[PDB]
Design a protein around this ligand. Structure first.
Ligand SMILES: Cc1ccc(-c2cnc(NCc3c(F)ccc4c3CCO4)n3cnc(S(C)(=O)=O)c23)c(C)n1
Ligand SMILES: Cc1ccc(-c2cnc(NCc3c(F)ccc4c3CCO4)n3cnc(S(C)(=O)=O)c23)c(C)n1
Ligand SMILES: Cc1ccc(-c2cnc(NCc3c(F)ccc4c3CCO4)n3cnc(S(C)(=O)=O)c23)c(C)n1
Ligand code: NA
Length: 359
């Protein structure tokens, strides 16, 4: 079971909106996690006796920047970890976590970026989701915009979250229009766009890189939640998503026995496989997370309580819940992160505090 071994507070005293363990950290190296809040990104190392060792921060030159998200990848030639961050300015920064140097930045969108995710099988492909109602897929090896997911049948309001499935063949996005939308990226059009992004070298051609504009999702529903959908994750062929209605819903497109790859864009049904209720988490902008193996699900609430669900059961509705509290932890938990082996769970709060729970 989990025990609270340490806590820390960042000097900016502003909310921490994101936290991610580096699941690409090398064997024998201590566990490292990044936090994002205010106009900063900070790295920490987990040590024995609950020690949280402070390393170094990246501080944006714009005091008005507010980082909302971060995601780890690694350099495709050297294997060294890389960290991407973004937020209110709509700028994607690729940071070398060793020196905390910004090694490249993309003017990602014409509005804030709410989430960043790297492709599960390709470390060069970065997905950003924005307040401009679109998703964008970047190839950070050739600095190209592969595709824009949005348009005439895309999201109709700010996009808050998105996730790749296990194989990275498809994306599920969600946002302020109450909808969850599916975008297949294993179509002939998208596989060709990705191949061409890798073949693009602006020094060796005259053409600009032509980005795809994908105006139509492969599936859409507004039948799961009745408010802003602010977090989505795939659980195999099933989806986990939440709104501010004190519930994570586990569902799937189509009827009970419909295969996800047979779902057509006109599909009008959804199937609910279960719902994980909790309390006092009815404010917008609260994230849930799963561990590496997807054996566990974690979410913090607006009064500092953590809920952890054991997903190692025959059906989703049988998930077993554990609650974790500490008398000194009373601020809203915006995001959690498990270490790759799930031995540590970190929670970050609105009062700039960091909470470490060891298994
Ligand atoms: C029918 C339609 C077409 C284009 C745009 C548009 C316009 N100008 C900027 N800039 N966009 C950025 N993303 C978009 S998106 C991908 O589609 O959401 C746009 C809009 C809003 N509607
Ligand atoms: C005819 C052809 C076209 C495209 C690709 C291709 C595709 N997708 C990624 N990555 C994303 C990725 C992946 F990793 C695993 C599964 C997956 C995807 C995208 C959708 O399903 N690629 C990376 N390099 C390439 S390459 C060798 O430069 O083309 C790809 C391939 C293999 N063949
Ligand atoms: C005082 C203050 C400042 C900023 C934010 C905030 C926070 N996070 C994102 N996005 C990241 C994001 C998200 F999209 C979905 C879920 C989620 C998060 C962060 C944690 O769980 N924001 C986007 N717009 C805003 S805003 C400025 O209110 O419109 C935010 C909050 C809640 N409070
Ligand atoms: Na830079």
């Amino acid at each position: 079971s989990f025990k609270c071994v340490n806590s820390l507070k960042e000097d900016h005293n502003q909310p921490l909106f994101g936290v991610q363990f580096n699941w690409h950290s090398k064997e024998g190296d201590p566990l490292v996690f990044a936090t994002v809040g205010s106009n900063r990104v900070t790295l920490y190392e987990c040590h024995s006796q609950g020690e949280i060792r402070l390393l170094q921060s990246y501080v944006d030159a714009d005091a008005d920047e507010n980082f909302y998200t971060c995601a780890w990848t690694y350099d495709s030639n050297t294997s060294h970890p890389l960290l991407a961050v973004a937020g209110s300015r709509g700028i994607i920064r690729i940071i070398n976590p060793i020196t905390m140097q910004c090694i490249k930045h993309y003017v990602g969108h014409g509005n804030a970026i709410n989430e960043l995710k790297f492709h599960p099988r390709d470390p060069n492909l970065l997905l950003s989701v924005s307040k401009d109602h679109a998703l964008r897929l970047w190839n950070i090896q050739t600095d190209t915009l592969v595709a824009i997911f949005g348009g005439v049948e895309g999201h109709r309001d700010e996009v808050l979250s998105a996730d790749y499935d296990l194989l990275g063949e498809k994306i599920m996005s969600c946002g302020m229009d109450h909808s969850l939308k599916l975008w297949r990226i294993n179509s002939k059009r998208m596989m060709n766009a990705i191949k061409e992004s890798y073949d693009y070298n602006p020094n060796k051609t005259n053409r600009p890189f032509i980005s795809q504009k994908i105006h139509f999702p492969d599936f859409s529903t507004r039948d799961i939640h009745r408010n802003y959908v602010d977090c989505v994750r795939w659980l195999g062929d099933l989806i986990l998503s939440k709104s501010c209605e004190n519930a994570i819903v586990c569902w799937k497109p189509g009827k009970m026995e419909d295969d996800i790859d047979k779902i057509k864009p006109s599909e009008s049904n959804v199937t609910i496989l279960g719902r994980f209720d909790y309390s006092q988490c009815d404010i917008w902008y609260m994230r849930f997370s799963t561990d590496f193996w997807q054996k566990m699900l974690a979410l913090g609430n607006q009064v500092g309580k953590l809920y952890v669900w054991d997903l190692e059961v025959e059906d989703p509705h049988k998930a077993k819940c554990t609650t974790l509290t500490h008398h000194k932890c009373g601020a809203a938990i915006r995001q959690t992160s498990f270490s790759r082996d799930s031995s540590i769970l970190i929670a970050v709060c609105d009062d700039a505090s960091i909470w470490r729970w060891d298994r």
